[PDB]
Design a protein around this motif. Sequence first.
Motif, short mmCIF file in Angstrom:
data_model
loop_
_atom_site.label_atom_id
_atom_site.label_comp_id
_atom_site.label_asym_id
_atom_site.label_seq_id
_atom_site.Cartn_x
_atom_site.Cartn_y
_atom_site.Cartn_z
N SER B 5 0.81 -1.23 0.00
CA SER B 5 0.00 0.00 0.00
C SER B 5 0.84 1.28 0.00
CB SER B 5 -0.87 0.03 1.27
OG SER B 5 -1.87 -0.96 1.25
N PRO B 6 0.20 2.43 -0.28
CA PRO B 6 0.88 3.74 -0.23
C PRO B 6 1.06 4.27 1.19
CG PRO B 6 -1.42 4.01 -0.84
CD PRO B 6 -1.17 2.53 -0.82
N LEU B 7 1.83 3.57 2.01
CA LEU B 7 2.03 3.99 3.40
C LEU B 7 2.99 5.17 3.49
CD1 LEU B 7 2.60 0.41 4.87
CD2 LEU B 7 0.43 1.62 4.64
N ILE B 152 3.01 0.19 -5.70
CA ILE B 152 1.87 0.66 -4.90
C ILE B 152 0.57 0.07 -5.45
CG2 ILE B 152 0.58 2.66 -4.06
CD1 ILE B 152 3.04 4.33 -4.29
N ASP B 153 -0.16 -0.62 -4.58
CA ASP B 153 -1.43 -1.25 -4.96
C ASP B 153 -1.29 -2.10 -6.21
OD1 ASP B 153 -2.71 -0.12 -2.74
OD2 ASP B 153 -3.21 1.72 -3.85
N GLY B 154 -0.14 -2.75 -6.36
CA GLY B 154 0.06 -3.69 -7.45
C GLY B 154 0.73 -3.13 -8.69
N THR B 155 0.89 -1.82 -8.75
CA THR B 155 1.57 -1.20 -9.89
C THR B 155 2.97 -0.77 -9.49
OG1 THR B 155 -0.53 -0.41 -10.80
CG2 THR B 155 1.50 0.59 -11.63
N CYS B 156 3.97 -1.32 -10.18
CA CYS B 156 5.35 -0.98 -9.89
C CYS B 156 5.84 0.14 -10.79
CB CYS B 156 6.24 -2.20 -10.06
SG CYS B 156 5.80 -3.55 -8.92
N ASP B 203 6.56 7.28 0.37
CA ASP B 203 6.04 8.08 1.47
C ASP B 203 4.70 8.59 0.97
OD1 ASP B 203 5.65 9.59 3.77
OD2 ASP B 203 7.13 11.12 3.23
N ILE B 204 3.70 7.71 1.04
CA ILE B 204 2.42 7.84 0.34
C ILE B 204 2.62 7.70 -1.17
CG2 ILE B 204 0.28 9.12 0.02
CD1 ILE B 204 0.60 8.28 2.83
N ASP B 205 3.29 8.68 -1.77
CA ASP B 205 3.71 8.60 -3.16
C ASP B 205 5.13 8.06 -3.26
OD1 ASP B 205 1.31 9.79 -4.23
OD2 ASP B 205 2.07 11.75 -3.58
N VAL B 206 5.56 7.74 -4.48
CA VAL B 206 6.95 7.38 -4.72
C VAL B 206 7.77 8.65 -4.86
CG1 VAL B 206 8.57 6.22 -6.29
CG2 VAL B 206 6.27 5.26 -5.86
N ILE B 224 6.04 10.52 -7.82
CA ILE B 224 5.28 9.71 -8.78
C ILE B 224 4.19 8.95 -8.04
CG2 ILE B 224 5.53 8.02 -10.65
CD1 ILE B 224 8.56 8.27 -10.29
N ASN B 225 3.03 8.73 -8.66
CA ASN B 225 2.08 7.79 -8.08
C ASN B 225 1.79 6.64 -9.03
OD1 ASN B 225 -0.93 9.93 -8.25
ND2 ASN B 225 0.20 8.81 -9.82
N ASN B 226 0.75 5.86 -8.78
CA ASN B 226 0.46 4.70 -9.62
C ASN B 226 -0.05 5.07 -11.00
OD1 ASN B 226 -2.10 5.53 -8.69
ND2 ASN B 226 -2.93 3.43 -8.89
N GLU B 227 -0.20 6.37 -11.25
CA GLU B 227 -0.74 6.86 -12.52
C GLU B 227 0.23 7.74 -13.32
OE1 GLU B 227 -5.55 6.87 -11.40
OE2 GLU B 227 -4.54 8.74 -11.97
N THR B 228 0.98 8.59 -12.64
CA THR B 228 1.68 9.64 -13.36
C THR B 228 2.78 10.27 -12.53
OG1 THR B 228 1.21 11.55 -14.85
CG2 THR B 228 0.31 11.63 -12.60
C1 LIG Z 1 -4.24 3.99 -8.65
O1 LIG Z 1 -4.62 3.73 -7.32
C2 LIG Z 1 -5.86 4.32 -6.99
C3 LIG Z 1 -6.03 4.24 -5.48
O2 LIG Z 1 -4.99 4.96 -4.85
C4 LIG Z 1 -5.37 6.32 -4.58
O3 LIG Z 1 -5.29 7.15 -5.72
C5 LIG Z 1 -3.98 7.16 -6.27
C6 LIG Z 1 -4.03 7.93 -7.59
C7 LIG Z 1 -2.99 7.77 -5.28
O4 LIG Z 1 -3.35 9.11 -5.00
C8 LIG Z 1 -3.01 6.97 -3.99
O5 LIG Z 1 -2.18 7.55 -2.99
C9 LIG Z 1 -4.46 6.91 -3.50
O6 LIG Z 1 -4.53 6.09 -2.36
C10 LIG Z 1 -6.96 3.55 -7.71
O7 LIG Z 1 -8.18 4.19 -7.40
C11 LIG Z 1 -9.25 3.24 -7.29
O8 LIG Z 1 -9.89 3.06 -8.53
C12 LIG Z 1 -10.87 2.06 -8.48
C13 LIG Z 1 -11.33 1.71 -9.89
O9 LIG Z 1 -11.71 2.90 -10.55
C14 LIG Z 1 -12.04 2.57 -7.66
O10 LIG Z 1 -13.00 1.53 -7.57
C15 LIG Z 1 -11.60 2.98 -6.26
O11 LIG Z 1 -12.58 3.84 -5.72
C16 LIG Z 1 -10.26 3.73 -6.25
N1 LIG Z 1 -9.70 3.67 -4.91
C17 LIG Z 1 -9.54 4.79 -4.21
C18 LIG Z 1 -9.14 4.65 -2.77
O12 LIG Z 1 -9.71 5.91 -4.71
C19 LIG Z 1 -6.69 3.55 -9.21
O13 LIG Z 1 -7.53 2.61 -9.86
C20 LIG Z 1 -5.22 3.25 -9.56
N2 LIG Z 1 -4.96 3.60 -10.94
C21 LIG Z 1 -4.35 2.75 -11.77
C22 LIG Z 1 -4.14 3.22 -13.19
O14 LIG Z 1 -3.96 1.65 -11.41
#
Ligand SMILES: *[C@@H]1O[C@H](CO[C@@H]2O[C@@H](C)[C@@H](O)[C@@H](O)[C@@H]2O)[C@@H](O[C@@H]2O[C@H](CO)[C@@H](O)[C@H](O)[C@H]2NC(C)=O)[C@H](O)[C@H]1NC(C)=O
Lengths: 387, 387, 387, 387
Positions: B5-7, B152-156, B203-206, B224-228
């Motif tokens: 997780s993003p701890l 983070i949450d499965g995305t490296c 630290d929450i984010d990368v 960086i986060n799991n998206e951008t």
């Molecule tokens: C990326 O992860 C998020 C959940 O993480 C949160 O948002 C991130 C962008 C980042 O700010 C983290 O620190 C946050 O904790 C995923 O968001 C989930 O998306 C699903 C599907 O749409 C949705 O059902 C949930 O509500 C979302 N969960 C939360 C807590 O918002 C997102 O899917 C991830 N993106 C990718 C591309 O993998």
Amino acid sequence: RPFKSPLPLCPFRGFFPFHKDNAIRLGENKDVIVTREPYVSCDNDNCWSFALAQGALLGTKHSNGTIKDRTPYRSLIRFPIGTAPVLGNYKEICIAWSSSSCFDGKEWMHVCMTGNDNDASAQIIYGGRMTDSIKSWRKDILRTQESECQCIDGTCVVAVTDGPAANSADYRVYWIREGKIIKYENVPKTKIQYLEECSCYVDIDVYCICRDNWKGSNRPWMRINNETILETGYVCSKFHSDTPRPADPSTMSCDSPSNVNGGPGVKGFGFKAGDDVWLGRTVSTSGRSGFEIIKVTEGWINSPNHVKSITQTLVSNNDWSGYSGSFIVKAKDCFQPCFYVELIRGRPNKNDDVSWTSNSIVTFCGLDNEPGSGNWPDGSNIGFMPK
Amino acid sequence: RPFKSPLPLCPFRGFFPFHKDNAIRLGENKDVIVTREPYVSCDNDNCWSFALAQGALLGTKHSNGTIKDRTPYRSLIRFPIGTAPVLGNYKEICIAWSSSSCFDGKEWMHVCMTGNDNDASAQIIYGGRMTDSIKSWRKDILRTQESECQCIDGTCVVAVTDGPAANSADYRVYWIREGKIIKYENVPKTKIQYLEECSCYVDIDVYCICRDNWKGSNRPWMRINNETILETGYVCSKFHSDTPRPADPSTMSCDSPSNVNGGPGVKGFGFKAGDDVWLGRTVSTSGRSGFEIIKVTEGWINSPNHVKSITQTLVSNNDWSGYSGSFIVKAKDCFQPCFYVELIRGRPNKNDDVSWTSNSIVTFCGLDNEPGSGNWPDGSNIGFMPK
Amino acid sequence: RPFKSPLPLCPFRGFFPFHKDNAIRLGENKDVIVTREPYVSCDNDNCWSFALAQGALLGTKHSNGTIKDRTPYRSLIRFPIGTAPVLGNYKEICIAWSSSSCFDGKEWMHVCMTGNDNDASAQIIYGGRMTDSIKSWRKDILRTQESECQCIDGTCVVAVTDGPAANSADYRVYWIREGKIIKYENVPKTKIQYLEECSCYVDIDVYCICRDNWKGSNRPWMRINNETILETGYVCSKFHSDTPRPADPSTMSCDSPSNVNGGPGVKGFGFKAGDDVWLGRTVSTSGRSGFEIIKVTEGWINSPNHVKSITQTLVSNNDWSGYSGSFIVKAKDCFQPCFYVELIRGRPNKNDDVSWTSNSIVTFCGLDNEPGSGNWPDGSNIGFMPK
Amino acid sequence: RPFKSPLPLCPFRGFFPFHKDNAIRLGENKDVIVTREPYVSCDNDNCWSFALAQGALLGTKHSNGTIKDRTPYRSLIRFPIGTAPVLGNYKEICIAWSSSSCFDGKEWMHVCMTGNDNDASAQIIYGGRMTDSIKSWRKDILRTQESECQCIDGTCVVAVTDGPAANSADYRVYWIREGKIIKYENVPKTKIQYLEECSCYVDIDVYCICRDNWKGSNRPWMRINNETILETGYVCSKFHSDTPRPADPSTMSCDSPSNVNGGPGVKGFGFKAGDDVWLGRTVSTSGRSGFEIIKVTEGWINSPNHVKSITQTLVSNNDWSGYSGSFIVKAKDCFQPCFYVELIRGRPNKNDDVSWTSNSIVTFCGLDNEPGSGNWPDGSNIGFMPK
Ligand SMILES: *[C@@H]1O[C@H](CO[C@@H]2O[C@@H](C)[C@@H](O)[C@@H](O)[C@@H]2O)[C@@H](O[C@@H]2O[C@H](CO)[C@@H](O)[C@H](O)[C@H]2NC(C)=O)[C@H](O)[C@H]1NC(C)=O
Ligand SMILES: *[C@@H]1O[C@H](CO[C@@H]2O[C@@H](C)[C@@H](O)[C@@H](O)[C@@H]2O)[C@@H](O[C@@H]2O[C@H](CO)[C@@H](O)[C@H](O)[C@H]2NC(C)=O)[C@H](O)[C@H]1NC(C)=O
Ligand SMILES: *[C@@H]1O[C@H](CO[C@@H]2O[C@@H](C)[C@@H](O)[C@@H](O)[C@@H]2O)[C@@H](O[C@@H]2O[C@H](CO)[C@@H](O)[C@H](O)[C@H]2NC(C)=O)[C@H](O)[C@H]1NC(C)=O
Ligand SMILES: *[C@@H]1O[C@H](CO[C@@H]2O[C@@H](C)[C@@H](O)[C@@H](O)[C@@H]2O)[C@@H](O[C@@H]2O[C@H](CO)[C@@H](O)[C@H](O)[C@H]2NC(C)=O)[C@H](O)[C@H]1NC(C)=O
Ligand SMILES: *[C@@H]1O[C@H](CO[C@@H]2O[C@@H](C)[C@@H](O)[C@@H](O)[C@@H]2O)[C@@H](O[C@@H]2O[C@H](CO)[C@@H](O)[C@H](O)[C@H]2NC(C)=O)[C@H](O)[C@H]1NC(C)=O
Ligand SMILES: *[C@@H]1O[C@H](CO[C@@H]2O[C@@H](C)[C@@H](O)[C@@H](O)[C@@H]2O)[C@@H](O[C@@H]2O[C@H](CO)[C@@H](O)[C@H](O)[C@H]2NC(C)=O)[C@H](O)[C@H]1NC(C)=O
Ligand SMILES: *[C@@H]1O[C@H](CO[C@@H]2O[C@@H](C)[C@@H](O)[C@@H](O)[C@@H]2O)[C@@H](O[C@@H]2O[C@H](CO)[C@@H](O)[C@H](O)[C@H]2NC(C)=O)[C@H](O)[C@H]1NC(C)=O
Ligand SMILES: *[C@@H]1O[C@H](CO[C@@H]2O[C@@H](C)[C@@H](O)[C@@H](O)[C@@H]2O)[C@@H](O[C@@H]2O[C@H](CO)[C@@H](O)[C@H](O)[C@H]2NC(C)=O)[C@H](O)[C@H]1NC(C)=O
Ligand SMILES: CCC(CC)O[C@@H]1C=C(C(=O)O)C[C@H](N)[C@H]1NC(C)=O
Ligand SMILES: CCC(CC)O[C@@H]1C=C(C(=O)O)C[C@H](N)[C@H]1NC(C)=O
Ligand SMILES: CCC(CC)O[C@@H]1C=C(C(=O)O)C[C@H](N)[C@H]1NC(C)=O
Ligand SMILES: CCC(CC)O[C@@H]1C=C(C(=O)O)C[C@H](N)[C@H]1NC(C)=O
Ligand SMILES: [Ca+2]
Ligand SMILES: [Ca+2]
Ligand SMILES: [Ca+2]
Ligand SMILES: [Ca+2]
Ligand SMILES: [Ca+2]
């Protein structure tokens, strides 16, 4: 754990460097076990290196003369993939101077031949227990694949041969289930004339690409399922893949050996892909040097359209190669095609001025991505080595 | 097992000595594998040492000339944390002359570059299987972090670079999930000008703190986060932390390289802490000797108040250091910040009169307690070593 | 797995030979890691050897001068019980020149001191993670037991000391739960005057028998539970058990050091048994040679009836011994009392003409059966060893 | 896991080569631990090699004189079956110069004798804990099988002897359950006169075939269950199987020693099969060279029909052999009969010009198939070995 299923091969368009053990380089200080005839096979948790050890450490006095193929001091050993085999990491699987291994989804099976040339026996090991055996019926070097067998829905299929290398041998396939021999078949000789050292993989059915050691510079093959041999032939590709062989382009022979540059051959492999075929081969057309893999358009079939659409040169022709064989790795719903290359150093290679014979290993796996290029030879300076 | 997780980072106020391998001292009798570019990464059960081996044992003839960065005989290897890498304890992860590894909570991912300088490829390994790859797009030493990636949450997330060291390279971040590449981004160059060998933590984010090898004695960074990619910059601290660098105090540059003492740099790390920053650095401002870590008050931000509130000298300036990088260890609900220091011995270090190049490792972890003081250098007498 | 409970000691009437590593004999060819201060501790699955390594292999040039107690190159290492510590079997637990370890029923805890003599810190490791630390408060060799700590219902108890060896040190006990320090106590000095290197076991409560290195040839002791120190004293036995000591019979002092032959002492152990006591000791009253264990009737109490009811001579006085310590092994509803003996070879032992200092280990366990007799010394011919 | 049951032996008609360690050949560079008295025993997951180590590496100065049977530096060690015993792969089980081990279905039990000849003790180890002991009652080399014991429904049966080799010793059987001694019996001497080094297996009941070291060239035997000794005798076969022995054919003695060529004997084994018997033996009738196994028609009973229906020559008479013993491997509903042969090299063998004494191992298992033929001797060139 379920038994492994008849999955198709995954899509692939090139091969990528996986594990490399650098075993000879690392054996300079006499830590490494002398081997030859390596291969790779995987279970649910790990891929493993296997090889026929020679019961001696590289560079010791007992390593002198290890060019000799069959002794009582050879065992099939297993060690972590890409590591050098050392006394501190190896496992001894069985006494063997010829072997095959495969994982059925639940347990490992091994086929281990040893004993006198005129009265060898094959021990079948399953889950670590010796469960069955095959007695030499032609009394002339009972022998097997030197690479992984294949198991479908609990039945393992393995190629086994007995009889004169150079005088009409009996090539068989055995079907073995939980370590017990179910049946065998004599390989049809309507097309295949010589069939040694099969390299097999699964693509729904088992496909084996083997070594004609007498008449064919093109490779013989068979397709097998959990019941029977389904099809046989020689690889149609006008680009041949045994060693020795004619220079490209050569003859197209789908149903018979090329009848040129037939022997002695070398263990090798290929992968059918639709009507196309991937074939590994030495770079040299005469000796065991270099390694490349080619994809031949329509190379599995009788066709005017054979062309080498891809050529990856993986070991340069200035470096020694050796045996090569296929192995598979389960993806999710398909098997990924991979292969290893044995990099033989020592006797009888020209200018490898040492008394022993051994090898290192390099491996590659197929992906549906475009590959780059490189060179991954043994890398030992033979002049640095204990002789 | 759940994905990591993003701890947030755990509270910490000083760094404490953890594991030390003494690998060079222990390699005096030629047991130890030659390495460089080590790092540490942890799974649910263990922390591990990783490094790029050179396919030779230290002090053997094949170890001569191992200053050379890229050969086919280099592999990423793994060995127990704080042990010396030996043939009896190592695992070979993949063929690589540049690498990164990280555990996603379920499985290990590795990124392994190898092949020709002008056509390298990166193999992605996940759960031991080669699952994807990256082809060199600039044809100039495709390369990666040389320390752990982050998941983070499965995305490296992993930093990957291709293009001329010294002529405008493409710095990218790749997002990879269960071994499959999802997307990449080109790192924005609005602030960052050069970005090599990122050291990253969560630290929450990368957060990644990297090496500008051309223009900046201050370190570039990204969030960086799991998206951008969320944010970029250079570390504001007027106390710079690359090597070489100006003597303290220097310039504050939050948005650009310092434009002094820019190259060649060295891989290093830091940890943002509120508006403050911890930075590792060599003790020397000119060479790779010594190691200290400083905490700079308000050092993450543009501020008149930069002061070194803490300086821990961990390796004296009379001893050689090298690369350093961050790793994290999961606490309960936070990540503990830790780091390793590569202690390089051999070429080209002045008076290390041997023909090889290798390293040992020392590691430290952060606690919310006041530290003591000590000195933990490589400790080998180079005159005792096989050359 | 439940936390370990406050079980009583099992019945026992003699000690029996368990594991022996023969580490020096086996190190003749330079395979073995240099160690001292070994001990044994067990988890649910295995008993383990632990020791302070010196970051060098025995007989190499880096082993010269390993009589030196504290260097940055010392680590606590773990290896299979009764095996010699080699690069292929050891694990590095932490950087340490003083240590203690114990298993709480769920995870291992370690206490590791390292750094400068005047500013050392103790790192607390729990389940492999560094979870807490102790800062030197007297700035003079912060140090601990050199044998296993003890854990009851999840709270581990460990003796920790800081301050001048030979000038009034602070002896403490720390209580640590899941790697987090809960509290400490200063050991009462109403009876105890010097308290080094405690050897502890569980018999409902924790009992520690330690080393007075200044004034007492009789051993100091304390009884502790998960909350507090319950009782202190010196072992009443008129048969003393430190080294040096007066010849038997000597003085009975339950509440103070004997004030004769007080230093330097040696780490040792004992077991209270009703009003009786078992005490380990060197055979020599002056030096670290031989090892015997005695049972003294009413030796735990003030009594006219002290007699040695049993004397087992386990290492002859013609052989070197060293430190000794207790460990426990869980039976079903009781703890079996066991101990190890460090067999020190090399400097400064008379006629051990080598430049290094190391040890082997032998261990014994208590049973409620009558023992036989034998002799289990180190067994190395020092003249055969690399110097 | 359930306790092992009283299963019958599986059908078998010949023996097949299983594992071979080549330990002496592999020890040429001083990596291998000196051993003798090896054996094999299996648990639910693996078969293991066991042996009495000598606390020295082969070819080192400490290996000189290892012909000596009993020293404090001998331990029972365990290592992977078919691997050479090295510091990087062995486990030390207990201090021992005589031993037996067996797995009861849940845990390993070991019986370990050590100490002075006139006051030895046997330590009983169960699940890694020392749980009981036997005190020497005749004060003359308390000793045991040197091969695996047998466990039925949780009760393990082990042969234990004390008293003069050459002057009327006490032969006993002990019954031990979860590491606790339940009872013993003195072996009846109505038929058996001397009973050393029993080799035992399970075929519903426990059968032991042993060594008469004084009067019998035929082997003594007993049948035992979880309660008591059921039957005793000497093997009826007119083809004797100890060493030395008369040339075939000799006398039939079912109830007494042959009274010719009685000593010193060698540890060996056999398997009753209906009224027939399989017997292992050296090829030589005078010395410890060669190894063969014979099946004797009606050889278990008093009969005019004794004939050798099968003779497998497994080690030629030009090669050294040594001890041999039985072990079993659980099939599904029966036990497969297997055996090992100790291949002794060094003193006192004629022309083994080295100062040490050690062995390698080869093993065979029974199948209900016809065997081939071969030869699997130690294979070391003694002239290549460090002396
Ligand atoms: C990326 O992860 C998020 C959940 O993480 C949160 O948002 C991130 C962008 C980042 O700010 C983290 O620190 C946050 O904790 C995923 O968001 C989930 O998306 C699903 C599907 O749409 C949705 O059902 C949930 O509500 C979302 N969960 C939360 C807590 O918002 C997102 O899917 C991830 N993106 C990718 C591309 O993998
Ligand atoms: C061999 O396996 C088949 C199942 O595999 C299929 O048929 C093979 C011959 C081959 O073509 C594979 O690729 C196919 O996937 C077994 O067929 C089963 O037989 C059982 C018992 O008769 C029957 O209950 C099921 O319906 C069959 N399953 C299917 C999917 O057809 C067959 O038993 C195997 N033969 C042997 C000798 O083991
Ligand atoms: C590799 O071995 C050969 C052969 O060794 C001889 O035969 C072996 C089976 C064994 O019996 C050895 O002890 C023998 O020496 C070596 O060639 C021999 O070398 C010796 C010594 O120089 C010489 O006396 C013999 O005449 C040689 N024999 C032959 C047939 O050539 C050779 O030197 C060994 N190679 C290395 C690198 O050591
Ligand atoms: C480290 O190696 C250098 C270079 O070795 C030479 O080139 C290598 C690639 C390989 O081909 C070697 O076999 C060559 O010897 C050593 O320097 C050489 O030393 C030799 C012998 O003294 C000498 O003849 C050459 O002229 C030297 N070559 C050069 C370019 O300096 C060097 O000695 C090695 N170092 C150690 C400690 O062994
Ligand atoms: C310390 O452990 C006790 C339980 O152990 C008992 O008391 C010890 C002081 C010692 O004498 C042992 O040998 C005894 O077996 C814990 O006592 C428990 O406390 C909880 C919470 O208050 C309570 O619910 C239970 O009733 C207690 N259990 C018993 C059997 O009394 C105590 O909490 C521990 N103290 C610390 C600081 O950890
Ligand atoms: C053990 O080491 C001593 C000391 O070695 C010297 O000091 C060390 C710290 C290191 O700097 C070494 O390189 C030094 O040599 C050895 O004693 C020395 O031996 C050398 C060579 O014979 C001699 O020139 C010095 O004068 C000696 N120094 C002293 C103070 O005695 C000793 O020989 C070593 N023992 C063994 C068995 O090798
Ligand atoms: C010994 O084991 C028996 C069971 O094994 C059977 O009897 C043996 C003597 C031997 O002949 C084996 O081959 C047989 O299979 C135990 O007998 C059981 O005893 C319990 C308790 O009295 C009783 O409830 C069961 O009925 C018995 N089981 C059977 C199948 O008879 C016996 O307890 C064991 N004796 C000891 C001392 O452990
Ligand atoms: C094997 O050892 C013998 C005996 O060694 C001697 O006695 C030992 C217990 C130990 O004390 C050694 O240090 C002794 O040397 C060796 O025979 C001896 O060899 C030495 C040197 O050549 C000679 O001086 C002695 O007289 C010899 N003693 C006897 C009784 O023969 C023998 O050489 C060793 N074998 C090998 C291969 O090294
Ligand atoms: C005996 C026939 C067989 C296949 C042609 O020969 C082999 C060729 C070899 C080779 O061409 O390198 C080496 C092999 N170790 C061998 N197999 C055995 C069992 O000896
Ligand atoms: C190629 C660029 C890169 C970063 C500046 O160079 C590195 C610097 C190195 C260094 O500064 O020590 C050693 C590295 N092994 C290396 N990376 C590779 C892949 O060769
Ligand atoms: C510093 C005091 C302490 C106890 C008296 O000294 C020790 C005695 C030693 C000894 O008497 O052998 C060796 C120890 N390694 C040591 N401890 C440390 C930490 O150096
Ligand atoms: C002491 C009697 C016993 C059986 C006859 O002697 C043995 C024979 C031996 C042998 O005949 O090779 C070697 C043994 N290691 C030994 N046993 C012990 C404990 O020393
Ligand atoms: Ca051919
Ligand atoms: Ca820079
Ligand atoms: Ca004292
Ligand atoms: Ca060595
Ligand atoms: Ca006899």
